[PDB]
Design a protein around this ligand. Structure first.
Ligand SMILES: *P(=O)(O)OC[C@H]1O[C@@H](n2cnc3c(N)ncnc32)[C@H](O)[C@@H]1O
Ligand SMILES: [Mn+2]
Ligand SMILES: [Mn+2]
Ligand SMILES: [Mn+2]
Ligand SMILES: [Mn+2]
Lengths: 439, 252, 245, 243
DNA sequence: ATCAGTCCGACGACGCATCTGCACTACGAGG
DNA sequence: GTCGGACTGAT
DNA sequence: CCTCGTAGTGCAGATGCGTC
C-alpha cells in the first residue's frame, strides 16, 4: 500500500557489487530487518523469483523470449524487428529494453486530454498484477496477457526497467541463493548464530518458505521445534557426493555396511492423510496429473495411517524382466492420454525408506529403524520391489556384486551410511549416501 | 499498349491462380496473339499445370509484343484472397513498378488495386503432350475429391480396371482394400469406353490435382490410356482451359 | 431493476469489442442511459459504449448498480442462444447478481460481483479533419485486405477519397471514392497522413454488423476515433492513438 | 452375416461417439441382437450397446455365435468418411471386417479381425430412487450449454423433480427443469443428491442422431444411469459412477 | 607456501504442450 | 544433471 | 431450390516449459 518498488530496486542495485558471501549476507539481513510485515512473504517470493512454490501444482507462466520481444516493442512504441536484431546482438534483454525508456518514451492516449495522477509503483500491486497475469489462460489468451504485461512494463522507470525482464526469465542474476537468505534471517531475527539450526529444520519440515517466514516475523524464533513433519508440503530427498570405488567405503563405515543398488528414474514422494494423495517430484511440483495410476498402489500395498515414503519412476519391459531407458520413459510423462501407453509402460514404485508413518517425528533416527520398517509394511508382489539387501564379505565379494549388476545392466551400486548420528537429514551433500559412477 | 486484359469472373481467376500455386511458388504467364497461355511443371514432372485462356473471355486485349512477366506467388496470394462479388471486374496493366492488379467489386462498391514487382521476359510456344487416350469421359466434380479422400487412407497406389467397359477402382494395400464401380452415368454424366487397360497412377498427386477443382462449376473432361499419362480437361465457367497430366512411374 | 432484452445477439458484439480490449470494467447503470466506459491497461485504447434504456422490453432502473464480471467468463455463457431468445437479469443484494437465460428451459446463474477500481477518463472535445461515412461492412474488406501481410496501417485524407494503404513488402492501396460505392458524406478540412497499430485496428472489427454507416473522425495531430450508430442513437465511442510517435 | 442399415449417418455417429470412452470393442452376432458391451480403461463408466433384428432392413443371419472385434481408430476414421443418408451395407468375414457403402454409387472397405475378448459386465439391478423422461434435443442443449465452466456437476433431485445445478467459485449454474417448463412428464421420486465430473457426462452428448428420447435413473452414491433410446427397440447405456 | 570440502548457477537441445491462424463445412435464414 | 568452477577454512 | 454466413472444426504453424 504505502510501500514502493523503488527501495527493493535500489537494494538490488547494491546487490551485484559484493562477491564476499560474508558481506552480502549482512546487507541482506539489514534489508530484511528494515522490511515491513504483511508483505514480507511476498517480498521473499520475489527474491527467489517465484510467485508461488510449485508444490501447489499451479500451471507455469507462458511468457518466453519472442513474446517478451513483441511486448517490449509494444510498450516502447518501437520497431519489433529492431529489438529482435538488438537481442541478437546483446545477450541481456534487460539492457535491450533499458535504453528504450530514457531517450524516447511512449505517448499513449492518457495525457493529451489532461490528467496528472501517477506515482511510484509498489511491490504489492505489482505482485498482485503478476499473479493475475500468471495463469489467466482462457481462449483469447495471449493478446490480453501480453497487453497487460507490456503495460505494466511501461508502468515503470528507466532504471528499474531492467530487473523485471529477468523476473520473467526464470532466474535472478544477483547470485544470492536460498541458504544465504536462511542464514541472513537467522542472523537478523535470532541475533545469534544458534538460531540457524531451527531455521534449517523448519525448511526441512515443509517445502514452503513464505509461511515459515511469516510465522517467524509474527511471534519469534520459538514455537517451531515441536512442529512435526506433517503429511502435506513435500520434503526433498537428501543429496550426496560423487566419487570412485576405492578401498574407502569399508573403512569409512568402520564395520558391516548396508550394500544397496543404484536405481534410476525420477524420484517419488507421497503425502497421504488417509483421504487424498499428494505426490511431489524430485523437484517441488505435483506429478499426479501425469501419474494417475501410481496413487493407487500406495493405498493397497502400503498399510497403516498417514505415511511418507520416497520412491523412483523407471519403466519395465513388458515381455519379461528387463529395464528400459529413461529417454524412452520421457515420452510417457507428457500426455493426458494415459490409457494408451501407461499400461504398456510398467513402472515399479521402488521403496528405499519409510520416512514419516507413526503420526510423530521419525526422521531423527538411525539407518536401521527405517530399513526394518520398510520390510514389514509391504505386500508380496512383483509390481513393487524393495532394497535388495545383499551382504558381502570383502571387496572381492563387493566387486562380485558390481559384476552381477553389470551383467544385469542398470546404473550400478550405491551404498548408504549407517550410524548413531548418521541419519537421513534434509540438505547439504554429506557422507550419509555415497553414489558410485565411472566411465 | 503492352498490358491490357480484363476478366469477367474474379472467382474463376483466383481459382486459376490457386490451382497453379498449389503446384509451385513461381508464375509463368506468356501473352501473345492467341491471348494468354501459361505452363508450370514440378521438378519430378509427375503433374502438369497449364492455364490456357481463349481470346474471347478478355473484354479488352491490347499488347505490343509477345512477352512474359516473371511473376511469383509468394505473398500476393493472401493479398488477393480478398476478391469477391462473383464476377467482379478484374484487370491487369503495365507499370514501371512491375505489375498492378485492379479488382473492383460492386457488392459494397470498393476498388482493390495492388502493386507487384516483376519484370518482363520471353514467350514460349504452346507446349502440350500429344497422345491417343482411347478411354475418355467428363464427370461430376465432387466424385474426384471423393476418390481422393477415400483412397488416401489405404495407401498410395491408384489402379483403375475398366474391363468390359465396367469401371473398377482397386488401390491401397492388400488388407485395407477398396472396391468401387462407375457404370454408365449412374454417378457420372458422360462416359466413353474404347479400350480396357490398367492405370497404376500416383494417388497422392491425384489428391493434389483434384485440390484444384473447387469452384469450376462445370463437368470436367477426363481421359487416359494403358499406363499412359492421364488427362483431365476443365472448361472454366467464365473462360480458360487448365488440364491435368498424371505422369506415371512405369510399372514399379 | 430487472432487465430483459428480447435479443441476445446485440449482447454478443458489445462483449467481443469489450473482451480483449480490457480485462474488467464497470457497468454504470444510470437512470437515463447505460453508461459503460472501459479504458485499457495498455492506455493505447479507449472504448466507450452508450445504449439508451429502451432496447429492453421497457425495463426501468431503481438505483446505481455495479455488476462486475470476467470478460472471458462473461462471453463464455452468452454464446448459448443462436435462435430468437432473450435473457432476464436482476439482483437485490450488492454482492450477488442473478442472470437468467430464458426462451428455452430457463437457465439462471448467480455471478459473484467483483470489484475493480479505475479513474474517470476525461471527456473528448477533439475536432477532426476527416468525416467519412463509408460502407461499414466495407471496412471489413479494407482491413482484412491491408493488414493481412503488413504490421502497420497508414491513412491519407485525400481530396475526395479515403487513401488507406500499408507500404513495406508491397503497397496495398484501396479506395472508396464517392462515385462507385464508397463515401456518402465527407468533410475534407485539411490534408492528413497518419498511421495506426496493426492489432488495435483488428480487434475492433467484429462489432460491425449492428450499424451500417460508420463516421471515422480523425486528422493530423489527432488520434483515431470512430463510432457506429446503434438503435436509438447508439454511441459506441472507440479511440486509438497513432503508432510510432 | 450381412447387414444393411438404412442410416449410414446415425450408426456411424453413435459408434464414433462411443469410440471416445473405449479403445476396443467386440461384436457378438447372435439370433436376435449383436451386442457391444465394453468396459472403460478407467473402470469408471461401463457402457453396453445392443441392436435389434429390425434396425437394418435386408439383414442376414448366418451363425449364432459370430464374435468379432476391431481396432477403434480404423473403424472410426473409415466411417468418418460417410457422405449422406446412403444405404450402407455390411457383410461378415470369418477373419476380417467387410464394409460396402451403397449410395449414389458403390463403395467398399476392408478391415482385419483382431483377436480380443474380455467380458466383465457389472450387473447393476440397482434401486434408483428416481425415474424421469426427457427428449434428446433438450438434453443435449442443456448439457452443452454450461459445460465450459469447470468440472463441478451435482444432479440434485426433489419430490418427482429432476434438476441440474453447477456450482463454481465465481459463478453458479441453476437449470430449473419441471414438467411445467420443459421436462416432458412422468416425474417421480424424492429429494436426493449426487455429483459427477463434467467432461465424463459431457462427451456423451453426441447421441443426437439415432435418437427418439431418453430416460434418467439415479440416486445418491449410486451409479448414475443414462439410457439413450434408439429407434425400433434400440438403446445404448452410459453407466457412470458418482465421485 | 600449499590441500578438502563446498556453494551455485550456465547448457542449450530440445518432445510435446497450447494458442493462433486459417481454410473448409454442415446447417440455419430468408428470397 | 552436470561439470565446472569459484569460495571457505587449514599446517 | 438458391443464395449467403457463421459458428464450429480440423490442420498446419508458431513459441515456450522442464529435463538434464
Ligand atoms: P540420477 O538419475 O543418477 O539419480 C536420480 C535420483 O535417484 C536416486 N537414487 C539412485 N540410486 C539410489 C539408491 N541406491 N538409493 C537411493 N536413491 C537413489 C538419487 O537420489 C537421485 O536423486
Ligand atoms: Mn513448473
Ligand atoms: Mn512461455
Ligand atoms: Mn538415479
Ligand atoms: Mn519458462
Amino acid at each position: 500500500s504505502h510501500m514502493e518498488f523503488k527501495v527493493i530496486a535500489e537494494y538490488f542495485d547494491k546487490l551485484e557489487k559484493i562477491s564476499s558471501r560474508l558481506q552480502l549476507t549482512a546487507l541482506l539481513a539489514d534489508l530484511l530487518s528494515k522490511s515491513d510485515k504483511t508483505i514480507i512473504d511476498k517480498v521473499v517470493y520475489i527474491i527467489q523469483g517465484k510467485l508461488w512454490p510449485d508444490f501447489l501444482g499451479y500451471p507455469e507462466l507462458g511468457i518466453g523470449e519472442k513474446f517478451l520481444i513483441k511486448a517490449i516493442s509494444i510498450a516502447t512504441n518501437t520497431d519489433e524487428n529492431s529489438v529482435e536484431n538488438l537481442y541478437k546482438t546483446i545477450g541481456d534483454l534487460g539492457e535491450v529494453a533499458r535504453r528504450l525508456k530514457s531517450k524516447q518514451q511512449s505517448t499513449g492516449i492518457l495525457g493529451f486530454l489532461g490528467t496528472t495522477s501517477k506515482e511510484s509503483l509498489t511491490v504489492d500491486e505489482v505482485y498482485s498484477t503478476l499473479s493475475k497475469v500468471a495463469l489467466t489462460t482462457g481462449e483469447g489468451s495471449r493478446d490480453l496477457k501480453i497487453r497487460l504485461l507490456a503495460g505494466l512494463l511501461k508502468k515503470a522507470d528507466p532504471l528499474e526497467a531492467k530487473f523485471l525482464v529477468r523476473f520473467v526469465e526464470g532466474r535472478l542474476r544477483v547470485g544470492i541463493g536460498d541458504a544465504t537468505v536462511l542464514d541472513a534471517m537467522a542472523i537478523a531475527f535470532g541475533g545469534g548464530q544458534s538460531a540457524s539450526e531451527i531455521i534449517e529444520r523448519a525448511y526441512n519440515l515443509r517445502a514452503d518458505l513464505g509461511n515459515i517466514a511469516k510465522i517467524i516475523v509474527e511471534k519469534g524464533i520459538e514455537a517451531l521445534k515441536t512442529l512435526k513433519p506433517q503429511v502435506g508440503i513435500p520434503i526433498r530427498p537428501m543429496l550426496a557426493e560423487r566419487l570412485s570405488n576405492p578401498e574407502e567405503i569399508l573403512k569409512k563405515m568402520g564395520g558391516n555396511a548396508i550394500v544397496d543398488y543404484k536405481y534410476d528414474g525420477e524420484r517419488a514422494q507421497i503425502h497421504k492423510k488417509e483421504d487424498k494423495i499428494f505426490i511431489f517430484s524430485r523437484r517441488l511440483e505435483n506429478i499426479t496429473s501425469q501419474y494417475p495410476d501410481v496413487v493407487d498402489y500406495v493405498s493397497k500395498y502400503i498399510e497403516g495411517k498417514e505415511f511418507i515414503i520416497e520412491g523412483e519412476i523407471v519403466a519395465i519391459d513388458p515381455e519379461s524382466g528387463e529395464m528400459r531407458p529413461f529417454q524412452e520413459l520421457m515420452h510417457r510423462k507428457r500426455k493426458s492420454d494415459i490409457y494408451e501407453a501407461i499400461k504398456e509402460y510398467p513402472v515399479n514404485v521402488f521403496l528405499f525408506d519409510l520416512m514419516y508413518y507413526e503420526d510423530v517425528d521419525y526422521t531423527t533416527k538411525p539407518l536401521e529403524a527405517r530399513r526394518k520398517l520398510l520390510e514389514s509394511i509391504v505386500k508380496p508382489n512383483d509390481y513393487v520391489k524393495i532394497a535388495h539387501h545383499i551382504q558381502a564379505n570383502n571387496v572381492e565379494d563387493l566387486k562380485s556384486f558390481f559384476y552381477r549388476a553389470i551383467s544385469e545392466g542398470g546404473e550400478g551400486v550405491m551404498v548408504k551410511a549407517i550410524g548413531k548420528d548418521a541419519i537421513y537429514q534434509a540438505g547439504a551433500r554429506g557422507w550419509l549416501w555415497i553414489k558410485l559412477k565411472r566411465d | 499498349m503492352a498490358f491490357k486484359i480484363v476478366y469477367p469472373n474474379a472467382k474463376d481467376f483466383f481459382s486459376f491462380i490457386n490451382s497453379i500455386t498449389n503446384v509451385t511458388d513461381s508464375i509463368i504467364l506468356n501473352f501473345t496473339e492467341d491471348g494468354i497461355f501459361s505452363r508450370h511443371l514440378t521438378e519430378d514432372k509427375v503433374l502438369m499445370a497449364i492455364m490456357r485462356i481463349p481470346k474471347d473471355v478478355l473484354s479488352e486485349y491490347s499488347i505490343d509484343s509477345p512477352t512474359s512477366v516473371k511473376l511469383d506467388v509468394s505473398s500476393v496470394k493472401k493479398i488477393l484472397s480478398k476478391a469477391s462479388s462473383k464476377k467482379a471486374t478484374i484487370e491487369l496493366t503495365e507499370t514501371d513498378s512491375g505489375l498492378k492488379i485492379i479488382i473492383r467489386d460492386e457488392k459494397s462498391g470498393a476498388k482493390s488495386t495492388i502493386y507487384i514487382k516483376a519484370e518482363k521476359g520471353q514467350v514460349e510456344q504452346l507446349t502440350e503432350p500429344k497422345v491417343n487416350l482411347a478411354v475418355n469421359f467428363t464427370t461430376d466434380e465432387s466424385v474426384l475429391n471423393v476418390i481422393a479422400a477415400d483412397v488416401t487412407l489405404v495407401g498410395e497406389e491408384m489402379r483403375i480396371s475398366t474391363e468390359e467397359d465396367k469401371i473398377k477402382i482397386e488401390a491401397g494395400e492388400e488388407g485395407k482394400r477398396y472396391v468401387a464401380f462407375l457404370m454408365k452415368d449412374k454417378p457420372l454424366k458422360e462416359l466413353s469406353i474404347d479400350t480396357s487397360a490398367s492405370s497404376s497412377y500416383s494417388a497422392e498427386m491425384f489428391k493434389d490435382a483434384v485440390k484444384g477443382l473447387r469452384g469450376f462449376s462445370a463437368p470436367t473432361m477426363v481421359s487416359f490410356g494403358e499406363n499412359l499419362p492421364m488427362k483431365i480437361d476443365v472448361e472454366a465457367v467464365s473462360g480458360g482451359h487448365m488440364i491435368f497430366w498424371i505422369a506415371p512411374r512405369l510399372l514399379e | 431493476m430487472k432487465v430483459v432484452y428480447d435479443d441476445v445477439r446485440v449482447l454478443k458484439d458489445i462483449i467481443q469489442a469489450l473482451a480483449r480490449l480490457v480485462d474488467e470494467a464497470v457497468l454504470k447503470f444510470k437512470q437515463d442511459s447505460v453508461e459503460l466506459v472501459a479504458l485499457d491497461r495498455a492506455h493505447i485504447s479507449l472504448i466507450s459504449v452508450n445504449l439508451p434504456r429502451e432496447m429492453f422490453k421497457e425495463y426501468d432502473v431503481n438505483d446505481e448498480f455495479k455488476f462486475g464480471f470476467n470478460t472471458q467468463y462473461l462471453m463464455k455463457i452468452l454464446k448459448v442462444a443462436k435462435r430468437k431468445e432473450a435473457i432476464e437479469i436482476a439482483s437485490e443484494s450488492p454482492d450477488s447478481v442473478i442472470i437468467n437465460i430464458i426462451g428455452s428451459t430457463n437457465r439462471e446463474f448467480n455471478v459473484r460481483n467483483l470489484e475493480v477500481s479505475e479513474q474517470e477518463i476525461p471527456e473528448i472535445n477533439l475536432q477532426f479533419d476527416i468525416s467519412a461515412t463509408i460502407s461499414s461492412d466495407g471496412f471489413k474488406s479494407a482491413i482484412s485486405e491491408v493488414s493481412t501481410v503488413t504490421d502497420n496501417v497508414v491513412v491519407e485524407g485525400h481530396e475526395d477519397r479515403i487513401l488507406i494503404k500499408a507500404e513495406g513488402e508491397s503497397e496495398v492501396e484501396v479506395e472508396f471514392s464517392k462515385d462507385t460505392g464508397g463515401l456518402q458524406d465527407l468533410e475534407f478540412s485539411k490534408e492528413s497522413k497518419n498511421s495506426y497499430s496493426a492489432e488495435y485496428l483488428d480487434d475492433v472489427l467484429s462489432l460491425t454488423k449492428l450499424s451500417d454507416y460508420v463516421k471515422i473522425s480523425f486528422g493530423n495531430q489527432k488520434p483515431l476515433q470512430l463510432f457506429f450508430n446503434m438503435e436509438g442513437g447508439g454511441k459506441v465511442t472507440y479511440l486509438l492513438a497513432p503508432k510510432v510517435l | 452375416m450381412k447387414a444393411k442399415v438404412i442410416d449410414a449417418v446415425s450408426f456411424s455417429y453413435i459408434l464414433r461417439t462411443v469410440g471416445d470412452f473405449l479403445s476396443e470393442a467386440n461384436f457378438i452376432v447372435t439370433k436376435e441382437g449383436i451386442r457391444v458391451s465394453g468396459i472403460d480403461p478407467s473402470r469408471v463408466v461401463f457402457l453396453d450397446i445392443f441392436l435389434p433384428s429390425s434396425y437394418f432392413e435386408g439383414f442376414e443371419v448366418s451363425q449364432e455365435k459370430e464374435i468379432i472385434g476391431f481396432k477403434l481408430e480404423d473403424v472410426n476414421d473409415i466411417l468418418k468418411r460417410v457422405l449422406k443418408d446412403d444405404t450402407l451395407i455390411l457383410s461378415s468375414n470369418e477373419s476380417k471386417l467387410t464394409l460396402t457403402f451403397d449410395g449414389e454409387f458403390t463403395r467398399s472397405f476392408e478391415l482385419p479381425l483382431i483377436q480380443v475378448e474380455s467380458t466383465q459386465p457389472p450387473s447393476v439391478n440397482l434401486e434408483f430412487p428416481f425415474k424421469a423422461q426427457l427428449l434428446t434435443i433438450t438434453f443435449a442443449d442443456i448439457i452443452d450449454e454450461l459445460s465450459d465452466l469447470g468440472e463441478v456437476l451435482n444432479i440434485h433431485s426433489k419430490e418427482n423433480k429432476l434438476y441440474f445445478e453447477v456450482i463454481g467459485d465465481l459463478s453458479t449454474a441453476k437449470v430449473e427443469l419441471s414438467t411445467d417448463n420443459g421436462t416432458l412428464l412422468e416425474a417421480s421420486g424424492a429429494d436426493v443428491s449426487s455429483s459427477y465430473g463434467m467432461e465424463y457426462v459431457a462427451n456423451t452428448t453426441k447421441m443426437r442422431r439415432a435418437s427418439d428420447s431418453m430416460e434418467l435413473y439415479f440416486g445418491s452414491q449410486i451409479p448414475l444411469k443414462l439410457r439413450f433410446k434408439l429407434p425400433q427397440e434400440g438403446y445404448g447405456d452410459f453407466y457412470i459412477a458418482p465421485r
